[PDB]
Amino acid sequence: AQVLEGKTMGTLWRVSVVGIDAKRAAELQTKIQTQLDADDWLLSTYKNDSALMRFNHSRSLAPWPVSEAMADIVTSALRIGAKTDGAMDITVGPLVNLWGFGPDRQPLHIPTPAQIDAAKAKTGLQHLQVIDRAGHQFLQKDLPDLYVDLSTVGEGYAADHLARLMEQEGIARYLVSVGGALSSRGMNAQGQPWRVAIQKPQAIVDINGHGISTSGSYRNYYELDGKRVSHVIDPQTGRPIEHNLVSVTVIAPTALEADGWDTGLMVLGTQKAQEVVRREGLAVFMIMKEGEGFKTWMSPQFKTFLVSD
Amino acid sequence: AAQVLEGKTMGTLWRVSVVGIDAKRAAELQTKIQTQLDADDWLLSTYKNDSALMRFNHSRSLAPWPVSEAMADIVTSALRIGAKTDGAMDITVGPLVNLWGFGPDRQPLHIPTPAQIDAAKAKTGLQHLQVIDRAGHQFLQKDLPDLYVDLSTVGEGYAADHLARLMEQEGIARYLVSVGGALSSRGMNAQGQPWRVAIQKPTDRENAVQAIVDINGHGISTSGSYRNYYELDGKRVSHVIDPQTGRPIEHNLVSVTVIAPTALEADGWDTGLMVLGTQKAQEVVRREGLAVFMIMKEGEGFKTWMSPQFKTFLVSD
Numbered sequence: 172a173q174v175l176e177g178k179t180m181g182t183l184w185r186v187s188v189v190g191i192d193a194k195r196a197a198e199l200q201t202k203i204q205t206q207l208d209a210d211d212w213l214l215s216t217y218k219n220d221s222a223l224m225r226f227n228h229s230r231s232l233a234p235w236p237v238s239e240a241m242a243d244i245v246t247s248a249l250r251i252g253a254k255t256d257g258a259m260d261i262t263v264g265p266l267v268n269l270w271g272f273g274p275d276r277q278p279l280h281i282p283t284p285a286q287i288d289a290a291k292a293k294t295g296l297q298h299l300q301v302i303d304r305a306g307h308q309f310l311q312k313d314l315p316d317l318y319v320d321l322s323t324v325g326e327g328y329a330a331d332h333l334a335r336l337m338e339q340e341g342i343a344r345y346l347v348s349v350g351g352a353l354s355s356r357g358m359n360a361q362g363q364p365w366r367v368a369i370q371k372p373q374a375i376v377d378i379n380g381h382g383i384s385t386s387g388s389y390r391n392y393y394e395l396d397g398k399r400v401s402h403v404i405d406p407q408t409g410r411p412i413e414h415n416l417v418s419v420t421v422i423a424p425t426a427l428e429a430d431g432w433d434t435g436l437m438v439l440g441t442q443k444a445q446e447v448v449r450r451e452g453l454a455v456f457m458i459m460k461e462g463e464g465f466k467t468w469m470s471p472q473f474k475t476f477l478v479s480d
Numbered sequence: 481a482a483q484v485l486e487g488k489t490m491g492t493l494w495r496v497s498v499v500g501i502d503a504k505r506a507a508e509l510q511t512k513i514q515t516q517l518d519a520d521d522w523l524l525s526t527y528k529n530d531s532a533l534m535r536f537n538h539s540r541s542l543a544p545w546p547v548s549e550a551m552a553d554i555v556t557s558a559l560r561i562g563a564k565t566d567g568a569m570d571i572t573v574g575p576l577v578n579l580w581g582f583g584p585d586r587q588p589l590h591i592p593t594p595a596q597i598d599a600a601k602a603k604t605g606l607q608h609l610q611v612i613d614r615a616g617h618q619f620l621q622k623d624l625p626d627l628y629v630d631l632s633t634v635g636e637g638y639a640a641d642h643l644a645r646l647m648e649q650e651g652i653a654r655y656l657v658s659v660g661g662a663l664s665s666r667g668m669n670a671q672g673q674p675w676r677v678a679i680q681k682p683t684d685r686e687n688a689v690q691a692i693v694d695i696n697g698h699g700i701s702t703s704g705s706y707r708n709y710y711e712l713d714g715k716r717v718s719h720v721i722d723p724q725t726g727r728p729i730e731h732n733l734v735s736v737t738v739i740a741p742t743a744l745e746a747d748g749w750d751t752g753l754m755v756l757g758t759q760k761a762q763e764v765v766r767r768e769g770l771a772v773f774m775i776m777k778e779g780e781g782f783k784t785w786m787s788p789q790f791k792t793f794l795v796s797d
């Protein structure tokens with residue numbers, strides 16, 4: 172099994188494949204990096220000349236020409252936005268910028284309630300549109316202020332796009348990983364399905380043909396005996412989320428959707444997250460704070476992906 | 481150990497083969513497969529007036545027309561294939577399909593006049609249709625009231641992909657699904673080997689030979705029939721229309737088989753390539769660069785061509 176590692180999107184990517192030799196794996200390293208750089212140059216909020224950031228810097232309310240991938244990513248992210256009751260909101264940009272959770276200048280003082288209200292007045296899923304045509308795709312906003320942030324959906328795409336690259340290179344047996352987003356196919360070098368482990372206050376899943384993603388870290392919470400001020404923002408309040416929910420793991424058809432649902436479920440909190448998961452029948456595992464210890468919950472749909480042996 | 485299921489949908493046949501479940505659950509899967517295919521039929525059919533597509537076609541509103549997520553993505557995929565085939569496969573070719581009587585419509589009393597053809601193809605065009613995607617809502621939009629969208633060459637492909645999604649949904653990772661000419665597969669046989677899709681090659685004397693491919697994780701679709709050509713000693717006036725001439729295609733290209741990431745794309749591409757013809761198709765296939773197998777007529781016999789990308793899918797055992 173040839174393993175490859177590198178850096179993309181301010182984080183790490185990992186690819187493992189079975190079927191090719193060391194020389195062919197070194198050539199795959201270059202092809203992977205090239206594609207991930209292109210995905211970075213398409214979606215990054217940290218690069219002013221990226222395709223998204225060019226759209227964000229534009230004040231135009233007219234249709235804004237984009238690639239097929241960009242249109243499909245935003246479309247996918249808008250749909251998750253509606254299914255999470257607006258919890259996962261890609262227009263949360265101005266709020267992200269206000270608290271200084273992106274590339275921009277750190278706030279001199281803690282944002283006032285007025286500053287918070289003014290910033291979320293620039294947010295809204297209603298304000299963004301995708302227009303698909305024969306040989307042309309467009310993003311459209313009805314508010315010049317609108318600032319789109321695809322951070323919670325980018326790694327997921329990168330992982331899924333990396334899986335397709337694996338396919339067109341003729342490789343059927345693989346594990347692809349970008350950040351916390353992961354996707355898998357076929358058997359590893361030892362004839363077993365790829366081993367994705369999830370930390371329990373350890374469970375092993377088989378997610379071949381699916382995507383997995385985790386938001387939050389129990390491992391960090393246990394070590395640091397506490398939690399960062401969250402970089403995940405609740406669109407309803409305009410403030411960082413304040414929940415006892417520590418970590419959320421989602422198994423979905425694509426890694427992009429797994430990545431998107433992660434944040435949405437974190438925004439909703441334990442009770443509302445479980446309710447939407449039951450209603451829409453999703454594969455979700457979550458860790459929450461319980462006094463001085465922890466409690467775990469996994470949906471019936473999540474249980475089906477566990478490996479017994 | 482393989483459970484095999486068959487039935488009818490969309491005026492053609494569907495086949496599903498599944499490893500990993502018993503007979504009692506395969507029977508239950510039959511019901512779930514049929515229900516979903518009936519729904520897909522009720523979404524995409526041109527032969528059913530109360531279908532979602534036909535409701536859009538009978539509407540002359542130029543404002544955004546509310547459709548399902550699937551409908552929006554199907555059309556999005558179809559328009560893109562339209563552009564990448566240089567307009568060859570055109571989902572707005574409806575009016576012309578209806579004029580020649582290739583759809584559900586009443587058979588023409590006389591052969592279409594050059595003027596009738598011009599008037600019909602003035603109601604066609606890829607630039608006349610767009611898709612609008614929003615949070616919680618999707619829309620189709622036309623700028624021409626007479627526009628008629630026909631998704632015949634993309635429906636079976638979608639149905640095959642949607643069926644493959646249901647297999648994953650039911651926890652089945654070892655399957656072969658097909659609707660009409662479109663097909664998709666995953667995993668191993670009951671004998672523990674990749675699903676074997678057979679593609680007919682021309683016969684030399686007495687030895688009938690065919691190529692075997694592994695298309696696991698991909699979609700495959702064949703347009704045209706070599707066996708029918710060989711037996712009948714010729715082909716019928718084609719139901720595939722060239723949107724440029726407004727006429728049935730008269731090419732020596734007998735059959736086209738495409739392997740693509742999805743069955744919908746394979747379904748959409750083989751019509752586009754059939755419209756383009758041998759030379760033009762081969763040029764696109766090399767530049768694109770697609771996984772294609774084609775059979776063309778060569779006088780009394782036939783010859784075959786397959787792209788380098790197609791050859792990678794061949795099983796060498």
Ligand SMILES: Cc1cc2nc3c(=O)[nH]c(=O)nc-3n(C[C@H](O)[C@H](O)[C@H](O)COP(=O)(O)OP(=O)(O)OC[C@H]3O[C@@H](n4cnc5c(N)ncnc54)[C@H](O)[C@@H]3O)c2cc1C
Pocket residue numbers: 180181182210211214215216217258259260261263267272273320321322323324325326350402403404405406434438
């Ligand atoms: C294309 C791309 C390029 C990147 N480039 C860089 C880089 O150059 N340098 C760098 O340091 N990091 C970069 N990142 C960030 C990268 O994802 C890192 O892995 C990240 O810093 C670590 O993850 P996280 O803990 O911030 O969680 P994340 O997965 O990044 O989630 C937190 C982020 O989600 C967004 N968010 C907050 N609330 C919501 C909401 N309610 N709905 C939707 N989204 C919300 C915010 O932007 C927040 O920063 C990039 C990300 C992408 C997708």
Ligand SMILES: Cc1cc2nc3c(=O)[nH]c(=O)nc-3n(C[C@H](O)[C@H](O)[C@H](O)COP(=O)(O)OP(=O)(O)OC[C@H]3O[C@@H](n4cnc5c(N)ncnc54)[C@H](O)[C@@H]3O)c2cc1C
Pocket residue numbers: 490491492520521524525526527568569570571573577582583630631632633634635636660719720721722723751755
């Ligand atoms: C959703 C759905 C429902 C159907 N319901 C019925 C039914 O109820 N009864 C029935 O008899 N048949 C029905 N059909 C068709 C059926 O599936 C058969 O497979 C088909 O009639 C036989 O295949 P064919 O030879 O026409 O090839 P096809 O794959 O059907 O391709 C030919 C068809 O494509 C269309 N076409 C022609 N030129 C172009 C062009 N250049 N660009 C794009 N498209 C073009 C035409 O409509 C033509 O009929 C349905 C098809 C679909 C997708």
